[PDB]
Every structure is written in C-alpha cells, then in structure tokens.
C-alpha cells in the first residue's frame, strides 16, 4: 500500500572532485618569481566575498584522505620547476643506474612567497568547519559554505612549519590513528614563537629563537600529550635518529639560499610529572623534494640576507616501547605541510532529485 514518489528540490550533497582555480593578488610589474608566476596562471581575488552559515547540519569531514591536497601539491611543483633553474639537474630513473644530467643557464633571483586562494568552479560548493576542537576525524557540528578559501602560503620546510596559521583555544594534536609508531604527529600554536636567523657580512650563520618562550611553549604542548597517556611515563625530546641530511635538520629557503639550522639544542628537555642560537650552514647540493634526484645551484650572493617568520607547527615521531616515551623530531613528506592548512575544507556537488515512499495513487 506504500507507493513511491519523486520530489524536486531536496537539498542533497555528493562529494566529488574537480580542478579548482587560483585566486592571487599579484602586481604585474614586480619581477620576483612568485609574483610573476601567480600573474600568469591565476586570477585577481574576489571583490565582495560572500559567506553563508548553515543551521542544525552535522557533517563528516576527514583530513587524511582529502582530494584538494594533490591539486595544490601539483601547482607548487609547477611553480618551482619554472622558478629555480639549477645548474645540474641529476635525475636518476634506474628502474645499474642510467643517471641523466641536464645543464642550463642558472641565474640568481628573488624569492618570497605570497598567499594563494583556491576557489570552486561553476557548480560546486566548499564547506568550512568553523569549530575549534576538530581533532582531525569525525563530525563537525558547525558548517558554512564559501566560494574561495582563506589565504594559503606556499611555504616549504622540514621539522618546523613556518608562517603557520594558528588555532584559538589550545595546542592540539592531530594524528592519523595514534599508537602506531609510524605516523606523523601534527601540532599547532596559539602563539607565534618568532624566529630570527640570517648570515651577517665563510658560509655559515646563526639561528636565534627567543629563549624562555620555547620553554613555556614546550610547556603548553607537553600537557596535551599526557592527555592520551596515564599521567606518568615521563616524556622528553631527543636528537634526530639519523638519516639523509635533509631530515636530521631544519632546512628551508630564504632569499635565494638553502639554510640548515642545526636544531639539536631545542629538544633536550625532560619533563617529570635570554637567547639561544643554532649554527646555520648554507649548502649547495640538495636532494630535491619534487622527485628523486639532486641539484647543484650557484654559490651564494655577497651581501647580508635576512628572514624572520613566526613558527606555527612541528612534526614528531614516537619510538616502539613496551616506562617512558621519547619524541624525536623528523618529517619530510611535503604533503604534510598542507594537511595543516587545508585540514578544514571539503568540496561537494548539489543534486536536487529525491524519491520517497508515501500513500498516493496516480489514476
């Protein structure tokens, strides 16, 4: 006696995947590399941005299986490959190795990154998660919609994020599963621990982080760890376990060089229940992150070069134990540096065609 009907207009989503498009405010006359690529294959920002809240609508986000990530982890690669031309680009295929080698004209250039906005194409939405306690997986009890996302900065680093957008309430801990000894912790900071490091006017430099903040901002985070462990088993921070040169360090780019600040002095603290410096050496032989291979750029520029940006994240790793626990830093998979900025978004498609069983008879 129960017959089926067909409504038209019901609000329904079905997650999908497409090719988004830039939104970045360039200048078109400056000639650094960022500000000349972002003005070639992107578009000025949105003059009057529109946002709309929703009401009584729970929704199941997920951070570790997103599909906007790749769409950024390809744009960034295509930005670098057109920007930093090496002098020897050794690229082993070796699937004895047939290691080819291309050589080019490799000049020196300016390099500072500007924020990039991803927008949704004509026919899809984007669902923020305006909560403040999203651990990383599960329902988000507050959801809005928006066309273009907030300002993302195409930064690249290791073992310490730079210019990281901050949380509000606490210092949270987002893990793939946790208690698996094989997945990267991700942290955040309610406060920016400003960092100053430069080479004065011998290819080496000193990295200085204001002391007595690191101690107090390693006191906040050390609490949340014991929120998942039995109020005991003292935790500390140890030296790197060792590996390739890029991992057991803090490397980045700054003005046109590749610093390596030996951050072995920041993780020696052990916790029971006015300045500090790091020997930043420049190198010229790096294992590129875009693929497997090596590069060889010029020798550095003459004058003084300086860079200061607030630290807003870490990457850690456990040790298989049984007691106590130790968190030796690490990282490297450059995907992680966006899963800490695109962690609260989603792209969906709207499909107005609904059926339901009721009591009708149509002649």
């Amino acid at each position, epitope marked *: 006696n129960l017959w089926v009907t067909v409504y038209y207009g019901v609000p329904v989503w079905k997650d999908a995947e497409t090719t988004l498009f830039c939104a970045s405010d360039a200048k078109a006359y400056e000639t650094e590399k960022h500000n000349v690529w972002a003005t070639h294959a992107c578009v000025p920002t949105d003059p009057n941005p529109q946002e709309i809240h929703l009401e009584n609508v729970t929704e199941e986000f997920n951070m570790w299986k997103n599909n906007m990530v790749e769409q950024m982890h390809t744009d960034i690669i295509s930005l670098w490959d057109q920007s930093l031309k090496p002098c020897v680009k050794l690229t082993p295929l070796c699937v004895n190795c047939n290691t080819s*080698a291309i050589t080019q004209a490799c000049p020196k250039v300016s390099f500072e990154p500007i924020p990039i906005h991803y927008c949704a194409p004509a026919g899809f939405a984007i669902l923020k998660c305006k909560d403040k306690k999203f651990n990383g997986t599960g329902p988000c009890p507050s959801v809005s919609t928006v066309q273009c996302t907030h300002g993302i900065k195409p930064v690249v680093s290791t073992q310490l994020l730079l210019n990281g957008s901050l949380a509000e309430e606490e210092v949270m801990i987002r893990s793939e599963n946790i208690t698996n000894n094989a997945k990267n912790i991700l942290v955040q900071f309610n406060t920016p621990v400003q960092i100053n490091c430069t080479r004065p006017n011998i*290819r080496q430099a000193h990295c200085n982080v204001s002391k007595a903040t690191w101690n107090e901002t390693l006191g906040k985070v050390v609490k949340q760890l014991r929120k998942h462990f039995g109020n005991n088993t003292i935790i500390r921070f140890a030296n790197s376990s060792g590996g390739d040169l890029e991992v057991t360090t803090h490397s980045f780019n700054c003005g046109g060089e590749f610093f390596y600040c030996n951050t072995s002095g920041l993780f020696n603290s052990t916790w029971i229940s006015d300045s500090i410096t790091l020997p930043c050496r420049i*190198k*010229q*032989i790096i294992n590129m992150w875009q693929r497997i291979g*090596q590069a*060889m750029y010029a*020798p550095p520029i003459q004058g003084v070069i300086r860079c200061v940006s607030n630290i807003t994240g870490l990457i850690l790793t456990r040790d298989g134990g049984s007691t106590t626990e130790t968190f030796r830093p690490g990282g490297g998979d450059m995907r992680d540096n966006w899963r800490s900025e695109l962690y609260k978004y989603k792209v969906v498609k709207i499909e107005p065609l609904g059926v339901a069983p009721t009591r009708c008879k149509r002649r």
Partner: antibody, heavy 128, light 106 residues
C-alpha cells in the same frame, strides 16, 4: 694537498684512440674537480673540458663535441681520457690539472674554474 | 677572445714588468695568469684577477676589471724570463678559452 702523476708518454698511429691516467694521491679523491689541457709545441694552451668527480658530469669544448670523452673512478683514485677520430695534428703534450673544492662530501661546492695543482706532462705522437 | 699586449715584451733587468691581456666583454672577476718556464709544468699566480696564490712573492699582483686587465711587477728578477698566459672562466656552460701568451727577455 694532492700529488698528481701523469702516465707515461705514448706513441700511436691515426684512426685509433688514446687513453692515459693521472693517479691523484695525497687527499680525498671526490673533493677535487679536474681538467685536461694540452699544448702543441711552439703554440698556446688549449682548454678541453672539466669533470665534477662527485656528480660525474663532464663538459666539452665547442670544437671537440662528441669525439672525446673524460672519465674517472672514485674506487681507485684515477682519472682517464679518450679522444676519438685521430688525426695527424694531435701530436702534442697533454697535462693533468685539478683544483680544490671544499668539503663537498656534505654538499658544499664552490664550483671553481681555474687550476692549482698539476702533473708533469704527457707527450703523444700520432702519424704513419 | 683574449687579446694580449704586447706579443713579446723585452725589457732590461732591474726594471718593472707590466703585461696586458684584454678580452671581448664582461669577464668581471675570472682571470688567471699562468707561469711556465719552458721544460716544466705551468704554475698559478693570480686568480680572481685581484688575489695572490700561495707561496708567491708580494711583487706579483695585477689589477683591472670589466674587460681590461694588467699584471704588474715593479722589479724584474732572475727567474722572470718565461711565458705568461691569460685564461678566463666566466661563462656558463663552461667554455674556457685561452689567449696567445707573452714572453719576457733581455
């Protein structure tokens, strides 16, 4: 520093190729780049090509492209050479030359251009 | 292209020594003068066009920039009758080319 010793003098005929050796001793091998240079009697010097030992990438002059190779081996601390399509003019003396490059084993590399340490010379003769 | 001046200088002892090697265009700071008495292996004296090699008498010093350079010695010596060559290593990809040299005699 290093101690370069070129191989012995050679005597050859047209059509064939050539091979020498410059045993570089007295330091770590992979820390130096090398360049082979030659001179015919009563003439000027002639830069030929450079080889980075750690990246194993060479280069060659515009007027020898494809008919001459350079190679080394960090397993034995020796540097080779081979020129192809012999002629009669190639009768000349050849020199082994290198230069320091810093602790490139940790990825710092100055990429110099000149030559500071040399051998003693190697004369070759090519004719009927 | 390396143009030198003169082809072969002849000067009496106890006098100074001032050679000249000129190039086509901007070789900003990559010049190297080599010494060789015939029957030997040549030697490095100047690199970077403004610096002195190791174990070298302080009278050995040149000058110049751009495309003009001159080796300058203020006092000839017993062992200063040999060949002197200029070499540049500026351009990339590496294509290094010498000049023609210069001789010094009594």
């Amino acid at each position: 520093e290093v101690q370069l010793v070129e191989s012995g003098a050679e005597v050859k005929k047209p059509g064939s190729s050539v091979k020498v050796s410059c045993k570089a001793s007295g330091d770590t091998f992979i820390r130096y780049s090398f360049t082979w240079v030659r001179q015919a009697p009563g003439q000027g010097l002639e830069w030929m090509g450079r080889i980075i030992t750690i990246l194993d990438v060479a280069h060659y002059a515009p007027h020898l492209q494809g008919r001459v190779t350079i190679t080394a081996d960090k397993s034995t601390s020796t540097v080779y050479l081979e020129l192809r399509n012999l002629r009669s003019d190639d009768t000349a003396v050849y020199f082994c030359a290198g230069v320091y490059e810093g602790e490139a084993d940790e990825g710092e590399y100055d990429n110099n251009g000149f030559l500071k340490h040399w051998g003693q010379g190697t004369l070759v003769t090519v004719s009927s | 292209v390396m143009t030198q001046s003169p082809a072969t200088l002849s000067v009496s002892p106890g006098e100074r020594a001032t050679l000249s090697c000129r190039a086509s265009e901007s070789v900003s700071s990559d010049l190297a003068w080599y010494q060789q008495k015939p029957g030997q292996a040549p030697r490095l004296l100047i690199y970077g066009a403004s610096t002195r090699a190791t174990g070298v008498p302080a009278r050995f010093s040149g000058s110049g920039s751009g495309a003009e350079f001159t080796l300058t010695i203020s006092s000839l010596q017993s062992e200063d009758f040999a060949v002197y060559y200029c070499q540049q290593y500026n351009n990339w990809p590496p294509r290094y080319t010498f000049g023609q040299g210069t001789r010094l005699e009594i």
